[PDB]
Amino acid sequence: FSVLKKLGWFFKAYWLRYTIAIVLLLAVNVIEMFPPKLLGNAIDDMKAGAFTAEGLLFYIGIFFVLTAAVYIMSYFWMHQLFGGANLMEKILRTKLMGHLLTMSPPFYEKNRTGDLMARGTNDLQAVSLTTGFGILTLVDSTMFMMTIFLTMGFLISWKLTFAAIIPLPVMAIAISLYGSKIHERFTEAQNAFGALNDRVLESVSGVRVIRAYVQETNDVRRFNEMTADVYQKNMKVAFIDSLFEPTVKLLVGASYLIGLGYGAFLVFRNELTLGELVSFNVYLGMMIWPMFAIGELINVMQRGNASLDRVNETLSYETDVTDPKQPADLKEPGDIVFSHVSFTYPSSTSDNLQDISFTVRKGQTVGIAGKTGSGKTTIIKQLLRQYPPGEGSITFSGVPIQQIPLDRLRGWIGYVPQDHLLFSRTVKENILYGKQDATDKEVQQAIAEAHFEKDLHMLPSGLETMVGEKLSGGQKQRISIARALMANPEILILDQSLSAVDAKTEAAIIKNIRENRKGKTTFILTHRLSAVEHADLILVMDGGVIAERGTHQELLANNGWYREQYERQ
Amino acid sequence: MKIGKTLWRYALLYRKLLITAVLLLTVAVGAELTGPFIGKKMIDDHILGIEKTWYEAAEKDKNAVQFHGVSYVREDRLQEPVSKAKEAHIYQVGMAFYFVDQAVSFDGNRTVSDGKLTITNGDKSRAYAAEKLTKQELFQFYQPEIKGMVLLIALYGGLLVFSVFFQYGQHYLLQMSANRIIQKMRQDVFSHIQKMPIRYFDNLPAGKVVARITNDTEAIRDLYVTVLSTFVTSGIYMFGIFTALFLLDVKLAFVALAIVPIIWLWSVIYRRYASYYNQKIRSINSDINAKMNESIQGMTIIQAFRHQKETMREFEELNESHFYFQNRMLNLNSLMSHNLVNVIRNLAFVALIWHFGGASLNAAGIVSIGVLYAFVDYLNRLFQPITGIVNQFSKLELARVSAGRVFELLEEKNTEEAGEPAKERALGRVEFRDVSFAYQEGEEVLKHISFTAQKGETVALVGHTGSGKSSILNLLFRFYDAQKGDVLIDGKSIYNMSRQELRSHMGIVLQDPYLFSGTIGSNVSLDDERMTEEEIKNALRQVGAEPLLKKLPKGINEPVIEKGSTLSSGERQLISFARALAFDPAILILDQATAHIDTETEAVIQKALDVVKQGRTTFVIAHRLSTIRNADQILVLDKGEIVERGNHEELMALEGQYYQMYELQ
Ligand SMILES: CCOc1ccc(-c2nc3ccc(-c4nc5ccc(N6CCN(C)CC6)cc5[nH]4)cc3[nH]2)cc1
Ligand SMILES: Nc1ncnc2c1ncn2[C@@H]1O[C@H](COP(=O)(O)OP(=O)(O)OP(=O)(O)O)[C@@H](O)[C@H]1O
């Protein structure tokens, strides 16, 4: 097993507690080997002539002392080891979340949400189990069994030990074999149950069509057939799942019978004693567990190896797609100029942007138009440092963005995406997201600026309601707009944020925002060309290039490009 | 509704398997538990038999052992050819055995100094001449018992294999009973789901209903496996153990019986603490997973707004609470569970030592080490299932609540009783007499809706959202009762025929054409199997390009395993149309509402509607107000009311709502 090799850092950080756990485990094992021998000695003293009240009292007292010592030391070594397990789990959760927070859209393009959730909910469990439970099974399968075997060999006898320990290895091997073939059948049965669940989901979601063709009878026939198949798979599992108790019972009772009969024969030959026979029986009883522990260790350590490999691959080797470099000395962006920038998404070969160049003065207002898929939002995505910078130069006041720190850049940009992104927090929290709780009065002023306060009033004032579990596309868009506004950004980007509200509402909002943000840059992306009529700069994006460049008047003068011919369709 | 009553009711079915499993378990337990009794007879009658009196007898006698030149035979094998003639003993001092060739009355502390065994017993008794038995002579006192030893060893193994076979049988039969009970429960649950009204499905996410039908049934299966394989099995195992304990020695049997209260109190306390800790841990872990999900989704705004620090702080707060409660659970498991099992085991050892030491001190010859060995083995068997029992008892609650949910579903009363397919064609005439439909109560979604659709097809129900267009579809199929007025098909009230009879007359096409997983032919036929390879109805729908791409949709192509995602948006509608045409319904209802019509494909849909609308009575809820320019009877729904009962041309002449919704498109 290389898991303990891949987790050297954890044990190095926590070595005192694991050292205490291991030492206390060895001590507990040693002082737990005593009580059976004391029982045998008591039996021998009973049979032998000399046995006075002093012996009885001493045996009772020593048994109580050993019981208390084993109890305390067991509590504390389990505390150390399983606390290490919990600490490893918590550390892995923290590390995984901290790594995710610093990742970029490309990483999630490569890595699906389902896989990432699985790693953070199962692989952590497996690794933590390895750190705590793997170590317990390693000590009990390697130290406890060897200690109990050596004690039986020396204190009791060697012939009796070897004879009585023949079936336990067979029991362990058979247990592992059953584990493998029950795991296989269990996977089969779980797949069958998944098929059942999928069919039930189909039959329940599409209940209208099923009912509309009086097919609710054929549906039940198929469901019953699939339940019958599930029953067959479960019975196949139970076939090998019912071989465990018979096997352990047989190969432990055989071990007890060998011990008892052979010990009786040795007693006949004076090579043993009744007390030692009873001690041998107790030692076998306490030795049956190390057999299971071997297989449990192998299983847990292999699973932990796989889980830790996956976690490390999706936690460390992944390199952040965007990073700061040589921080500049720019406080407020003067102008934003694109100079023949070309950028292609990491997951595609088409350029999607061909030598785009333009300027945006401080306070300049830019509108973007174009058909769906015509690189409309890519122009601002390239400005959010979400993807590799490609080729060209995007210089804020004359210096490329790479020099600007990511923190400062993200501070300048107030970004409203076309997609609705809200969290399971009250609207107050969704709007406050921008300013991270610097003030509360500004909420009223910001919501008035977005002109959304009226739709805030008719919703119940239950801490501005709840979002993320329920309500309206327009209301979500206005909440996002207020969130981006309240931050007081020096470059405010809106991406189709007004495609859901009416023409009058969007017109009023754009008028108000243009009036309020006089010395600040604003980017507007919207298919409604009537919503950027007042923008001092407007451009239309087709493919990777710009079809034309000029003010609204220039576009009006040029050929009819989806200006008003589509009003009222 | 009582969960226990319903579970017992479902278990009473298949009682043959349960009874057989119980009997097989009883026999296996009897064999296994009589094993240690065989061991205690072995130790006492045979190894310790030497401690019994010996009487001289002739060498002719069987089971006679020569000591020096004189043959003795034990009190158990003794017969009455000679009354006593002798009284010899084989006493034990230290690790040596001493032959006493004299009658001894008392017994006690034995001492040998100069070949004069003396038993004190607080009386000094007498000094008896004693001779060390060496090892060969001593073994010659055990050869008579070697054969009984071998015989008892053999009996042990036979009963062991017997118990093995019966253990396998009982475990398998318990598993079979659990699985079959759960299969019957699932059958009942789905059959009931087929009878629940559409209100139930509408007012409850599909995933929740599916989980109730499937997941909760698995929870009940786990509950059955727990009750049988843990509580019944352990109950019988411990009843047999206590029977054996009482048969061995009653005095210690009562003491051992005095641990059942120890199990009950332990179970109650551990349940109390572990249920709380598990509830908190599960809730916090659900919160952690939800946070991770809502952070991975929507991470763009988290990063763009520099919220990484705050989200990390919230996640760490949840993580610290989770760590706290996991450590508390570990603390409880350390103070209880295996540690307490070992403590009780050592207490049992001490109790045995105390009892047998008190017995031996009185020197009444009642040490009975065989009873001690059997008690050790039995008590050791009795402490195995304690941890499993307490864990399962704590865990019962989740399966109990799952069973409550499943039986709440089953015990639903408002269910539809139907199942009569129609025996005659509809003739295509559907009429409404001032129907007034209210979903919840009081609030009306349709007010005195009244219209008649002759055999001529293409009746259009078009209006602005919230006008109750799809409610008519619900009324037609009797998904929801009208609550007023009436609906007639061919003059027959829709509320005077079985829902199955009514829905046989009509076919449905919806906005999201359902594409059941399977073959295209089975999806078009709804795996009915009651129709032949007539899926050339699909071709009649003008699907001439899709079915030649690969294999054949007529039960030969299986691309629908992807929920229709890969197939074009228009092609799914073109499969649903084929399904509607295959069943040949008299009345076709077509609920179409798609702003993103996906042009360059919707054309075929129109073509499809020309092939299916003919020779029926078709209701078209389509939007866009352009596919219904040939509707025989247009209808405009406003505020749940037919405000303009007109035609494509008549409505245009009269202007109004339809004119506005046509000019603005
Ligand atoms: C993170 C997870 O942490 C865990 C840590 C430990 C365990 C654990 N699993 C165990 C399984 C068995 C035993 C066990 N210890 C025993 C001691 C004696 C006996 N016997 C057999 C019966 N009689 C006849 C003799 C004595 C059985 C025994 N079984 C202990 C165990 N401890 C599980 C999870
Ligand atoms: N996840 C992605 N993987 C690959 N290419 C993508 C991805 N998302 C978008 N694109 C590319 O982006 C092109 C269009 O750019 P983008 O989607 O940013 O703007 P748009 O669609 O024109 O306008 P809007 O995005 O506002 O609808 C698409 O045609 C596609 O080639």
Ligand SMILES: Nc1ncnc2c1ncn2[C@@H]1O[C@H](COP(=O)(O)OP(=O)(O)OP(=O)(O)O)[C@@H](O)[C@H]1O
């Ligand atoms: N199962 C239901 N229970 C209660 N009210 C419902 C139910 N289904 C729909 N409604 C409501 O009843 C009214 C009727 O709307 P209907 O279902 O006919 O859709 P519509 O108004 O035709 O248009 P659209 O489907 O585009 O929303 C609406 O207020 C709708 O939200």
Ligand SMILES: [Mg+2]
């Ligand atoms: Mg509608």
